[PDB]
Design a protein around this nucleic acid. Structure first.
Ligand SMILES: [Mg+2]
Lengths: 110, 338, 83, 94, 99, 141
DNA sequence: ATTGTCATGGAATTTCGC
DNA sequence: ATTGTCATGGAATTTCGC
DNA sequence: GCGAAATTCCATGACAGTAGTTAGTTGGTTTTCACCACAGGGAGAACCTGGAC
DNA sequence: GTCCAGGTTCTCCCTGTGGTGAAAACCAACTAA
């Protein structure tokens, strides 16, 4: 026999990051023994807010330097432009980025 | 306009028939009578109730929530088989409290007698059932095995073992535990024997399972007056309080006495069919019950048409999914106001 | 309960005495308005991480292992009180 | 064989707030490995929250406390309220 | 109970593990979950919106074996509702109290 | 009964838990008194107090004086969604004299005694009508 | 020192037309 | 292409004694 | 007196706390492989700006 | 102010990367207890 229409749990919460894949990365990562049904929902949302907030800021730096695609320099520069995004990734190197443009305003020429 | 002995009432136009009732129906989503008394405050016209029934057949927000007030009819008592090893009624019990790493107990009741068989396992998988019956198919081979539509029995693997033995698998109608008859009774026996033994101690019930298929299998059926041993074998084994009344006979001739013992047994009584019974009709609209109804959800699905009627208790309906889901008539409801 | 003017409770010798444990001979008079600032940054990143543990178990008392768990989080482990 | 990833689920977020924007391959892997790292910080602090309160159960309450620890200041105000929308929408369904 | 003695509330409790004792509330909870069930078909269950509806939709359902509103048996006359009686407007309110 | 609601604010009081003006309802023939407090005197804070009233009582005609929330635009957008045509006597004098002097005299303790003020008004005898409004409302004698 | 219930659709019943 | 059941104690019933 | 219409009757079922968990299967989602229409850069030059003076 | 150096912008051609379309694979969700 057949069964009902399989509605994915990512579409039942209005998210884009999956909840089926997150819920088997809380029971095969030995984080705890029981994982609630609402926990990979709530975690796939916080993975989805923070994935926007970089790419929101990574979209602007691509636009301000006339680019269609976002190369890692923009991800390097979207981070450390925002203050609170930088304090999350304060220890973290991003590959192929270089640094922000910075002079200490004492080395200016005389 | 019209005059009534309770006041002045209003005759609406013929174009205003469906609109005036539908706005009174959806005020509280009532059925036939509380709908009608709303219209009995402003309006009145000949054949009010032919229009209220015209509403509710289209109002598919009210067909899938109200339940039937029409019970199903008389229950069927199917006959006993004429030999043992013809119908086994199997159903896991448990999760019980644990002992020796066991939680689930397969219970194989013979449909001839009541002779239970126990085969405890760790988890109700397919393969835990298959080795549990290879002990029991060592005794003899059944024709038919009844069950419920279990998680382990409906597997495509379990049926491929069952076709080897000559097992005719039989499954109950879904969400109908009343179909599996004797096994739901002996599970109220096993949990009234193991309950009585285990009073005042830790439930170490894996010790007491060789007791149960020897203590229940020598309980006299108090309305048949025989052991399960005698109706299965013919004479008692070396048990306490065993009959010597058969030792005055020849075993070479009481085999055919035993076939006349088996055909004189008590048959149960069908209850009288109550007044608000209802019968399925091929072509009548019926509604199944939603399987596991979530909170604040329809209890019933959308209407469906009966394809075939098998007995007056088992009917094949055509679900919204396109499903030939062979349900009982303790599942269905008569679709209101056809 | 509210008791203010207690970032000024870290008195002028008690920052000098902490300076002497670091091996510092001569200090300025403008460290005192810098130390009280860097101290309250460090206690607004521990008490903010400690209370979310105590609220999570629905306790009303921030216990001894709570602070150690907060200091476990930042990468500055404190022995001697458990955890 | 199969490498699971979060690369597909970035285009379903990149095309939400910047619909005329592509993203390179070597910048996908950063936002790929941003996710897997910020996954196991939140999980691996919710995990150690299970032992600290003697439960074997990761609830959706424990992920909320393991986001109010890792995210500082103003991200901890939004990403909490950007989860409890996606749960209340989820539980009113099904 | 200490609040209940202030009001003059005589608290009455059912016999334990006997939900059949509380009579009507176990019936109207099968009404509220057959009104809020019927409204919320095919949408997310946002039932906190629909609670001012329910104590105005059930409280004007005619008891089909008593033939009255809950409003009339509580107050005496309908409020400004759709399909309200005018059969009581042929009477005096000063005398239909004892009616 | 359920004929016409003469509805008027009272205030501005000393606030208790952020409530300023008290919505007082005067019934059409009976004179029953609902007392729903409002946060602000706006149209937004009275309709949400009137929505609790609409589940119990709906009047045939809503009729009072000229104000900001009792004469508004969205107030009539909601009222015509219901279907109410826009346009006891001693209970009006309690608005100006009695209840203003009852809800002033307690610093924050007027919010607590709102049912205590309410239940005494409905059991008050009316010599003109020869009943109390609670008895006229519910039809018990 | 407390107790079912009550909306609901065949189906039987009564009205009543002339 | 499926369907209650059956142990169990008042209580009614039958045996039957002489 | 037959038929149709308004009404009353009555037997029934569901509400009770409801969340889960497991086992087996299926449908849809996802990862991957092959692909081309393209975006950005590389190159040259024309235009440009400020620091060298 | 002045001249020039190294840069920045604009355009044209070319390539590599990406975004996608199609099958396979596997997991997630549903079903019955
Ligand atoms: Mg079962």
């Amino acid at each position: 026999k057949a069964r009902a229409k399989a509605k994915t749990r990512s579409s039942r919460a209005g998210l884009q990051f999956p909840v089926g894949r997150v819920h088997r990365l809380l029971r095969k990562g030995n984080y705890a023994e029981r994982v609630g049904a609402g926990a990979p929902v709530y975690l796939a949302a916080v993975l989805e807010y923070l994935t926007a907030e970089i790419l929101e800021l990574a979209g602007n730096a691509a636009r301000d330097n006339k680019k269609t695609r976002i190369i890692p320099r923009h991800l390097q520069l979207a981070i450390r432009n925002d203050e609170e995004l930088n304090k999350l990734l304060g220890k973290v190197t991003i590959a192929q980025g270089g640094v922000l443009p910075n002079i200490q305003a004492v080395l200016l020429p005389k | 306009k019209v005059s009534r002995p309770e006041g002045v009432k209003i005759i609406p136009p013929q174009s205003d028939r469906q609109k005036i009732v539908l706005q009174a129906h959806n005020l509280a989503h009532t059925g036939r009578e509380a709908t009608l008394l709303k219209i009995a405050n402003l309006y009145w016209w000949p054949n009010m109730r032919k229009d209220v029934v015209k509403q509710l057949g289209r109002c598919q927000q009210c067909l899938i929530t109200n339940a039937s007030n029409k019970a199903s009819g008389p229950i069927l008592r199917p006959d006993r088989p004429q030999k043992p090893f013809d119908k086994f009624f199997i159903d896991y019990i448990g999760p019980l409290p644990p002992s020796q790493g066991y939680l689930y107990v397969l219970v194989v009741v013979d449909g001839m007698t009541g002779f239970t068989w126990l085969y405890p396992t760790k988890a109700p998988s397919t393969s835990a059932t298959v080795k549990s019956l290879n002990v029991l198919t060592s005794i003899a081979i059944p024709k038919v095995i009844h069950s419920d539509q279990g998680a382990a029995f409906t597997s495509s693997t379990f049926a491929e073992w069952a076709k080897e033995r000559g097992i005719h698998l039989e499954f109950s109608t879904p969400y109908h535990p009343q179909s599996s008859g004797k096994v739901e009774r002996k599970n109220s026996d096993i949990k009234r024997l193991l309950t009585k033994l285990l009073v005042g101690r830790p439930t170490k019930w894996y010790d007491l399972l060789p007791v149960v298929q020897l203590a229940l299998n020598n309980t006299y059926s108090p309305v048949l007056k025989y052991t399960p041993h005698q109706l299965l074998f013919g004479i008692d084994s070396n048990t306490p309080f065993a009959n010597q009344d058969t030792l005055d006979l020849t075993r070479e001739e009481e085999l055919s006495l035993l076939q006349e013992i088996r055909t004189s047994l008590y048959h149960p009584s069908t209850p009288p069919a109550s007044s608000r019974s209802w019968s399925p009709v091929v072509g009548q609209l019926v509604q199944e019950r939603v399987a596991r109804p979530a909170s604040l959800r329809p209890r019933w699905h959308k209407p469906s048409t009966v394809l075939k009627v098998l007995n007056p208790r088992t009917v094949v309906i055509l679900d919204h999914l396109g499903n030939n889901r062979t349900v009982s008539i303790d599942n269905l409801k008569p679709t209101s106001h056809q | 309960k509210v008791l203010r003017d207690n970032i000024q409770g870290i008195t002028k010798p008690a920052i000098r005495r902490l300076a002497r444990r670091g091996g510092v001979k001569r200090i300025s008079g403008l460290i005192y308005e810098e130390t009280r600032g860097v101290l309250k940054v460090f206690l607004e990143n521990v008490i903010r991480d400690a209370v979310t543990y105590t609220e999570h178990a629905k306790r009303k008392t921030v216990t001894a292992m709570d602070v150690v768990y907060a200091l476990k989080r930042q990468g500055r482990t404190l022995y001697g009180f458990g955890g | 064989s199969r490498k699971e990833s979060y690369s597909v689920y970035v285009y379903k977020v990149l095309k939400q707030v910047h619909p005329d924007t592509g993203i390179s391959s070597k910048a996908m892997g950063i936002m790929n490995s941003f996710v897997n790292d910020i996954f196991e910080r939140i999980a691996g602090e919710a995990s150690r929250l299970a032992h600290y309160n003697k439960r074997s159960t990761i609830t959706s309450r424990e992920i909320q406390t393991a986001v109010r620890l890792l995210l500082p200041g103003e991200l901890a105000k939004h990403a909490v309220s950007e989860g409890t929308k996606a749960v209340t929408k989820y539980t009113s369904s099904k």
